[PDB]
Amino acid sequence: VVADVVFVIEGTANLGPYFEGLRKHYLLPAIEYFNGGPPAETDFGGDYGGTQYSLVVFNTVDCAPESYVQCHAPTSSAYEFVTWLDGIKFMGGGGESCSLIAEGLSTALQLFDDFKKMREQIGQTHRVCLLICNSPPYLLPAVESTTYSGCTTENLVQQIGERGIHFSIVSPRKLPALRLLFEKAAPPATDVSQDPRHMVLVRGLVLPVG
Amino acid sequence: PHWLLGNLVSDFVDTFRPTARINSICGRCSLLPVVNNSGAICNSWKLDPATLRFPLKGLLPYDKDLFEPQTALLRYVLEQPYSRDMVCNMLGLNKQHKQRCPVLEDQLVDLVVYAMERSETEEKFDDGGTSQLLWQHLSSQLIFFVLFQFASFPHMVLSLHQKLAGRGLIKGRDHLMWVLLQFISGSIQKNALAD
Amino acid sequence: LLEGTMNLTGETQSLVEQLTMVKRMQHIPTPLFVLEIWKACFVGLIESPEGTEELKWTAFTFLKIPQVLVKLKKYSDFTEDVNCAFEFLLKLTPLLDKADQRCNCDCTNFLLQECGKQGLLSEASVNNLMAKRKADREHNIQPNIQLILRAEPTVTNILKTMDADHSKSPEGLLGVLGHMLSGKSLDLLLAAAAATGKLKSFARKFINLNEFTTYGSEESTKPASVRALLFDISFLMLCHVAQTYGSEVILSESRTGAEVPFFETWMQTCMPEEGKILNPDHPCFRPDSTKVESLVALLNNSSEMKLVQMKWHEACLSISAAILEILNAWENGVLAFESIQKITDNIKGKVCSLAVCAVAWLVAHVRMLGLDEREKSLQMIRQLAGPLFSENTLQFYNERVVIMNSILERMCADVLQQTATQIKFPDTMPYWNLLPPKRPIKEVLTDIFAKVLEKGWVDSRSIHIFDTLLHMGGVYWFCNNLIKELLKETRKEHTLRAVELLYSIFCLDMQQVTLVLLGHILPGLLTDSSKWHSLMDPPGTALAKLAVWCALSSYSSASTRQKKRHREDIEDYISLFPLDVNMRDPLNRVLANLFLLISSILGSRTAGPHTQFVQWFMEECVDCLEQSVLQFMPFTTVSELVKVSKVVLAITDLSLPLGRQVAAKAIAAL
Amino acid sequence: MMDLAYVCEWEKWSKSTHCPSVPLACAWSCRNLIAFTMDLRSDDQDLTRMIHILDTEHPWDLHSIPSEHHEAITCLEWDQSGSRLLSADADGQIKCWSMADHLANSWESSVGSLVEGDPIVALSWLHNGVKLALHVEKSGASSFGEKFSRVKFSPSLTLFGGKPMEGWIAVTVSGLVTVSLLKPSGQVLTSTESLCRLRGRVALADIAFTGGGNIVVATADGSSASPVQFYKVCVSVVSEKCRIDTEILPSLFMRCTTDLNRKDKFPAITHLKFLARDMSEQVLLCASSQTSSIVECWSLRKETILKWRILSATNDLDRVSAVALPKLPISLTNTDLKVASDTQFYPGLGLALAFHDGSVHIVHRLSLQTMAVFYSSVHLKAMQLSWTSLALVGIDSHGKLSVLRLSPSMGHPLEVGLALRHLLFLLEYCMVTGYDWWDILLHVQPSMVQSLVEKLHEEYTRQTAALQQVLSTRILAMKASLCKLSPCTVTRVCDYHTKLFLIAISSTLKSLLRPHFLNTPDKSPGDRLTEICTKITDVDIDKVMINLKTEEFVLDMNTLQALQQLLQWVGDFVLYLLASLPNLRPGHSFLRDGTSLGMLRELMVVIRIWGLLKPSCLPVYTATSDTQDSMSLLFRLLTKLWICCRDEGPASEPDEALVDECCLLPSQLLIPSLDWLPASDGLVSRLQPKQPLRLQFGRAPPKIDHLRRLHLGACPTEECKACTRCGCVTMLKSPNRTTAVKQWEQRWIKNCLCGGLWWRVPLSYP
Numbered sequence A: 001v002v003a004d005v006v007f008v009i010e011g012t013a014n015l016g017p018y019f020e021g022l023r024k025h026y027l028l029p030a031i032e033y034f035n036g037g038p039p040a041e042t043d044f045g046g047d048y049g050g051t052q053y054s055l056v057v058f059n060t061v062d063c064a065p066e067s068y069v070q071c072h073a074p075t076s077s078a079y080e081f082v083t084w085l086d087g088i089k090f091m092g093g094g095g096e097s098c099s100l101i102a103e104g105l106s107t108a109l110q111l112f113d114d115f116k117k118m119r120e121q122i123g124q125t126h127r128v129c130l131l132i133c134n135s136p137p138y139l140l141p142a143v144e145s146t147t148y149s150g151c152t153t154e155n156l157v158q159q160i161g162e163r164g165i166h167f168s169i170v171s172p173r174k175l176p177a178l179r180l181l182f183e184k185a186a187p188p189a190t191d192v193s194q195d196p197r198h199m200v201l202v203r204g205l206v207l208p209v210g
Numbered sequence B: 001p002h003w004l005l006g007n008l009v010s011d012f013v014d015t016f017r018p019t020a021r022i023n024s025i026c027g028r029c030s031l032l033p034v035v036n037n038s039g040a041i042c043n044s045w046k047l048d049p050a051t052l053r054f055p056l057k058g059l060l061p062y063d064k065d066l067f068e069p070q071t072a073l074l075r076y077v078l079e080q081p082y083s084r085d086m087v088c089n090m091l092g093l094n095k096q097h098k099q100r101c102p103v104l105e106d107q108l109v110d111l112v113v114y115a116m117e118r119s120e121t122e123e124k125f126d127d128g129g130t131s132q133l134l135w136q137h138l139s140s141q142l143i144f145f146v147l148f149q150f151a152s153f154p155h156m157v158l159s160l161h162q163k164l165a166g167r168g169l170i171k172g173r174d175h176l177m178w179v180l181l182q183f184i185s186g187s188i189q190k191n192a193l194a195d
Numbered sequence C: 001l002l003e004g005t006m007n008l009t010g011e012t013q014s015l016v017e018q019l020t021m022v023k024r025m026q027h028i029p030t031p032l033f034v035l036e037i038w039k040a041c042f043v044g045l046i047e048s049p050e051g052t053e054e055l056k057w058t059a060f061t062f063l064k065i066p067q068v069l070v071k072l073k074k075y076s077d078f079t080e081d082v083n084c085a086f087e088f089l090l091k092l093t094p095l096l097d098k099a100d101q102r103c104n105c106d107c108t109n110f111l112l113q114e115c116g117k118q119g120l121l122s123e124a125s126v127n128n129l130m131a132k133r134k135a136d137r138e139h140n141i142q143p144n145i146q147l148i149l150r151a152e153p154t155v156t157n158i159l160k161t162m163d164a165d166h167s168k169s170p171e172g173l174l175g176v177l178g179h180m181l182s183g184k185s186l187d188l189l190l191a192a193a194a195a196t197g198k199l200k201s202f203a204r205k206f207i208n209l210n211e212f213t214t215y216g217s218e219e220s221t222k223p224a225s226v227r228a229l230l231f232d233i234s235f236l237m238l239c240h241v242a243q244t245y246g247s248e249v250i251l252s253e254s255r256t257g258a259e260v261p262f263f264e265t266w267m268q269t270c271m272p273e274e275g276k277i278l279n280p281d282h283p284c285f286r287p288d289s290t291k292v293e294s295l296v297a298l299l300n301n302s303s304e305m306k307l308v309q310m311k312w313h314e315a316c317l318s319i320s321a322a323i324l325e326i327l328n329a330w331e332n333g334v335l336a337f338e339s340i341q342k343i344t345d346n347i348k349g350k351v352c353s354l355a356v357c358a359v360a361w362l363v364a365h366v367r368m369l370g371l372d373e374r375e376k377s378l379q380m381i382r383q384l385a386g387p388l389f390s391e392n393t394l395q396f397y398n399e400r401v402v403i404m405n406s407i408l409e410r411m412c413a414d415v416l417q418q419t420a421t422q423i424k425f426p427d428t429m430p431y432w433n434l435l436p437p438k439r440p441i442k443e444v445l446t447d448i449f450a451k452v453l454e455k456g457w458v459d460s461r462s463i464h465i466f467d468t469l470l471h472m473g474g475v476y477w478f479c480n481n482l483i484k485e486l487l488k489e490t491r492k493e494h495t496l497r498a499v500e501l502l503y504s505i506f507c508l509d510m511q512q513v514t515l516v517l518l519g520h521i522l523p524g525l526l527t528d529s530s531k532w533h534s535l536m537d538p539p540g541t542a543l544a545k546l547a548v549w550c551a552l553s554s555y556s557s558a559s560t561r562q563k564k565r566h567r568e569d570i571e572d573y574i575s576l577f578p579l580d581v582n583m584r585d586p587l588n589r590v591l592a593n594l595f596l597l598i599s600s601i602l603g604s605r606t607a608g609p610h611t612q613f614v615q616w617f618m619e620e621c622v623d624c625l626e627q628s629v630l631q632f633m634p635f636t637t638v639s640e641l642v643k644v645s646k647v648v649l650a651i652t653d654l655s656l657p658l659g660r661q662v663a664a665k666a667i668a669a670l
Numbered sequence D: 001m002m003d004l005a006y007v008c009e010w011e012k013w014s015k016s017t018h019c020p021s022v023p024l025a026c027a028w029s030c031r032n033l034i035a036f037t038m039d040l041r042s043d044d045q046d047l048t049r050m051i052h053i054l055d056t057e058h059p060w061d062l063h064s065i066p067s068e069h070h071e072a073i074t075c076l077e078w079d080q081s082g083s084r085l086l087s088a089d090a091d092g093q094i095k096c097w098s099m100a101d102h103l104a105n106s107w108e109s110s111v112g113s114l115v116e117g118d119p120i121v122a123l124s125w126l127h128n129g130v131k132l133a134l135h136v137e138k139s140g141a142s143s144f145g146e147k148f149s150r151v152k153f154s155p156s157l158t159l160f161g162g163k164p165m166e167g168w169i170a171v172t173v174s175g176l177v178t179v180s181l182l183k184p185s186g187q188v189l190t191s192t193e194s195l196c197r198l199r200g201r202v203a204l205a206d207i208a209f210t211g212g213g214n215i216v217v218a219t220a221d222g223s224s225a226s227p228v229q230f231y232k233v234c235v236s237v238v239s240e241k242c243r244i245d246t247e248i249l250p251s252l253f254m255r256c257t258t259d260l261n262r263k264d265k266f267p268a269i270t271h272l273k274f275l276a277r278d279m280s281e282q283v284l285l286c287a288s289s290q291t292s293s294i295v296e297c298w299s300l301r302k303e304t305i306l307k308w309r310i311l312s313a314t315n316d317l318d319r320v321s322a323v324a325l326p327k328l329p330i331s332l333t334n335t336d337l338k339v340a341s342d343t344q345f346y347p348g349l350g351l352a353l354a355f356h357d358g359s360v361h362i363v364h365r366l367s368l369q370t371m372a373v374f375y376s377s378v379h380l381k382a383m384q385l386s387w388t389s390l391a392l393v394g395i396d397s398h399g400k401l402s403v404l405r406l407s408p409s410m411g412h413p414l415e416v417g418l419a420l421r422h423l424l425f426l427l428e429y430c431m432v433t434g435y436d437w438w439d440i441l442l443h444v445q446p447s448m449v450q451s452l453v454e455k456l457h458e459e460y461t462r463q464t465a466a467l468q469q470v471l472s473t474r475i476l477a478m479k480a481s482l483c484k485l486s487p488c489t490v491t492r493v494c495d496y497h498t499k500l501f502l503i504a505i506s507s508t509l510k511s512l513l514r515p516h517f518l519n520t521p522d523k524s525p526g527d528r529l530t531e532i533c534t535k536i537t538d539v540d541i542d543k544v545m546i547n548l549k550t551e552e553f554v555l556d557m558n559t560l561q562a563l564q565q566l567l568q569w570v571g572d573f574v575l576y577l578l579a580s581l582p583n584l585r586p587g588h589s590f591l592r593d594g595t596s597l598g599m600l601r602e603l604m605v606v607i608r609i610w611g612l613l614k615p616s617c618l619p620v621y622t623a624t625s626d627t628q629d630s631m632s633l634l635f636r637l638l639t640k641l642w643i644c645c646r647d648e649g650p651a652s653e654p655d656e657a658l659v660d661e662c663c664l665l666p667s668q669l670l671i672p673s674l675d676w677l678p679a680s681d682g683l684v685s686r687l688q689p690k691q692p693l694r695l696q697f698g699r700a701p702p703k704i705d706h707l708r709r710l711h712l713g714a715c716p717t718e719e720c721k722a723c724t725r726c727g728c729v730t731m732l733k734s735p736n737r738t739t740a741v742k743q744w745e746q747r748w749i750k751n752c753l754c755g756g757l758w759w760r761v762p763l764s765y766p
């Protein structure tokens, strides 16, 4: 069915080694579920009706004069999305444990606002957001965003949870903060983890049970 | 030439300029035939299928235009109705053997983009106005030349995409789509869909 | 063809010097030389656009070129050679028939009678040539050639009769001037006066007439209404001269005392030309506050009724401030559109020069403004340059309207090009806005040079586009790209033709082009180790020829854009060429630096194509010279050049007492 | 005031002969890298087409990109970050150089534009909408939100989100303008369009941006009696393609043409510059004759609604050879002008004007009155101020490249508290951004260093607990680089770098353990480990290891084996520290820091658990006995040291039992040796005021890999990167790509841990 899919990925050294495994087990099947059957080179962008994928990659504060979030424009090709998922290079990090989840979520919110101004042929669609993270959030409010500046991760994930965006978390290391954020993004009113170590909670989307 | 010979050879070839000047039909680039379907091709209009150049006797220093690809002659012949066998007799095509002749393919693409330009001029002042006649003849001619693999479909389409990229030629795109529909509807079952 | 297209008004001595130079560079026989002059003149006449350019071309061929030949005869058995060249030309029947169709008469007859009058040709030669031409020809309005050939004596006699204001009879002056304002008569007089060197005296005469009719004397309406018309006729013809034949014929070039005339200052500070953009709030456009209120009250009174004493220079200087206050009043809203129509009618009605002064200030002011702020002021031009106000015209109104519409076309054209606005006065601007709107300018340059090579000669339109590209991309870009397009030729014939054309193209600004060529292009080709594969024998011999022709012609020693731009230019050639006669003249510095480079290349190891280049450069320096560019050669080159392989010594040495010692050393020890 | 920090000259590669000079470009990035071109002219003209990258802390090492530019390079332009470099020459050809393998020594351009034949005369990156303003009157305000504040600027061409596109805009010598937009994918969209319909010469041009996402491009044709025209450009993307919309703005003429006394002099406009990109309303023009010149400042200010009026002009100068505008974005209003005149803060109010004699004038922004004068004792053909505007770099009319320091009060003497507050304000500005602070360390005297360090720590406190998170390693790097500059404080820098390294190991080891099941939830196993190690003060290692759920601390025994060298460094540093206890040395700070000793305890406990899982991961100690448990011995001594410092308000001097037991440690084990990171070759310690270093390019006035702790040989065979600030060396490509702990190696791909860039070092070949 029509879907506005937004992936939010932590592009840091953590999630570096574990990303290839996560993609085969969880991310790639999730794209197929939105796009029935695996994509191969015939899928064309430009159908404004239909499922539209997008990436948001974020970083920590060690990329000091560079920007924090790299966003990609929406595509209707699942194949271009797969090439974008290959094209991420995980180079960041340093002496820290946290990352800028608030930035990635705020730009995901701006993506969903631009999607909502885009699709008017349908009032509401399946608005799905995934967060592929390996790290607890920073305590910084969001700085490099307009209309969602000065907001912590809890406020932003409340605004994700209300208005009916289906929020999911795929993490290769089981963590408390990520679980708390997932519990908070509750939509108004099954073991999918193939590996025991992986923590995967999916509010929306169907992934083969393992 | 090599930097040690230099003038010694170059001036020598320049003294063979008058002999080449004797052996040149003057205004040969601008002489055009009347296309008859009769066959029995006069061998004056034969071009080289590799490079669209006139076949020249000798190694003389001929005039600078005779070393250029004669695209004007080939476009004039392709724009005429019933110039099917004459283009094969020009470019040496044989129809027992399929070849993917490239310069024919590029000339057909440039003919399509010229038709698209001339359709985008107005096409609405005169209803017939030679535009839709040109598109019908383009349909027939291009069906034959892509069908026997003298040219190929996907290289033609993507080169056509590179010519129309950014030029902003949109008023008669329906005609171009119609011509492509003639190819696809003619030969979808023979080739794979990736073509 | 260049001297015909750009400076018809140039002196013949510069052209004779340049042509004798070209005849000495490439050794040209005299019959082929004069044949190329006549062929160029006729081809340029045929390719001329209809209008003033055709009159100018008829004058250049009929009057200036015969005078040039006379000067060549004095400087140089010329009659036999010019007769040979005329038979050479008379073989070319299609050229002469195309010319005769444009001339509407046999133009070769007028040429042969004119060259008979000047004394280039004997009379028997003239008569058998006209017999041959009539035999080859066998297989109500006067044409322009008769009009021009008879109009040049009228130029001299009109000078001598209007020295004295027709014995101070202004009614007579007005009638004769109205006859001049009639169709094409002014243009005929100006073309004849330009081709024959008498445009300066003509401009002095109309300027002095203007100064006489500026103030006026105690008068009733009928005498003053003549004096204001004399101001209009003199002003409008002076503006037409300055817009057609350049502004430098209007200048006085030495005014002892402060009494510069009104028109010279107005043209200096207030009239748009091609390369002149004007400051609308220059102090020239703000004369007073006292007179301008009297003038706006004057324009709001009614029909002036007070033309009996106006001091027209003061009025014309004050219109700019007047229409500035009118514009401020209309921008606030305190003035209605209908009163604006009344003020524009009071300006443009009785005297037409007021409209020209106002439109000049309006063009400056609209050029400074932004996009959205312009909309009102353009309407002012639409009313000032509109069709005629009627029923109170003094006399000769339609002809002044026609001349004024031409002047306002050439004033407004640039501003009305910036925003797409059609004012539609009714070609009169045949070579204007020639470049394509979006295409990068190297494609323009390479296409025009490709067509000039494939023809074999340079058109008039091609000369104008080459001028605009030299002004636009600058000298270095121009000369470098044309030399690149030379160096990718591979044939001997095309390289020699390209060089013979590029010399004439570089004659737009020969001096600056030689500084760029021998200073930047050639040292960059000789010093770069990757570049000198481009210096192979086919293009390389041609390039060495072009460099030495450029060096000689710049040493022995021209358009108005080029004059303005070299006056703009600041550079320190002492700092550019540090160098390890004057030697503060930059060309001597470039030549000394180039010869140091040539000696360094000849002396070094690793002989390649660049060594062949500097060999060829020195050989055509020897051959092209009469005797001096080679005065700057270092004396070590005398030794080294025969180390790398007689006359190349004995010419290059310049023969000082120490110079004999180096000469006798090299020649004996070959 | 002005002091020449250093003068770097080419050796024997000057004396350009027989080919005339060319104008030079110069560009100082946010990271301190100068990109510049010079007229070398020896055996090739490509020696005038090489782009030299000079890291400003190690100038001898000059990289030389052989750009494939067939004509002379007009413009160089760094990114808004410091990571890409745009270079454009005559005849089109804009190239966009990016780093290769994140080395500052290898550049390669894959992306570029081309408008063939037309010379590029202005070039700029597009604006990304980030702009901040510095309130100097709030320098003491104790919160960084009050001192530096973002000013709500809009980026030209936002694309589907808040995210700006990156791209450039160039202006040719014809009327053409071109915009190239880089996609997030490798695609690039180009579009060219004429500026106005009247196509004309553009001999000088400049580009500023506005709020609202409009570019404002100023054109002049050099004649100085013709108007300096202005165009508003608006970029858009229509469905696949870039689209440029231009509109004429009010032009200006220039004074000294309406002077009417002698108006004919100064006939050439030679420099046109907006006062800063994103400050589009003020314009600096420079008319010049052959000998004299005039600079002028103009402003658009409205009343004809918009109209250019003059602000100020100089009287008469020498011929201005180069112009450098500042980059520090001061707040520029009236109160801040007052307080920056009272407290003599002058970093953002200066332009530098070189002249055709030796002199250089630092002149005011608003009313161009000369603030300082530096006589060279030959002219500056290119100048550039720094991002904190304390130093200006400049290329001369020879091979010489010089760096001058401008004092922040321009030579007027200040009391020490004001100089402290100025330099502290600038270091805080470099801390909030990510810019480099090297130019500040040009101005730090030794005698103030310690006081400055104190102020940094007091400003590291009293921020709002997320700033303290994000400014940790930046303030450790700034503390180390400051403490390098004084002989009293030179001993502590090693400690700071090991402190960085300790945290860099500690978190990563606590990052690797993925808890297989969540027992006692809401605490991650890093925090469970820290809680358990801080409440259990048992001196034995077994009694701590028992209570720590050791089925959770499991790895795959492959990465667990590959962690051997980092665990070796942990054990060796602990042993070195405890043996160093009886004695100012490389370990003196750690003996009294309770937190670092706690971290070392936690790592020893997880090392013990991982050794029980696989015994090959353990560090090795050459023991002078065979019935010994060396790990338990070191843990006993570490707990007995740490219980000294984990007390509340303690400062307990260590008792004599620990002293004699740690005297016995060289008897029981062999204390190996250690490499300490800041191998100092930085110039700032070497420099002195009033003495300039005269350097040659390429002359440069127990080998370990410090990040993966591998011993290279005597003369190492594999090639290496060196950090540009601390000096740590790593080998360039990983030794075993299969067994590589990518959680540790992928942290330092783009930078070092101290923050500086990597820089490829050449092999010896002895």
Ligand SMILES: [Zn+2]
Residues within 6 Å of the ligand: D723, D724, D725, D726, D727, D728, D752, D753, D754, D755, D756
């Ligand atoms: Zn470092």
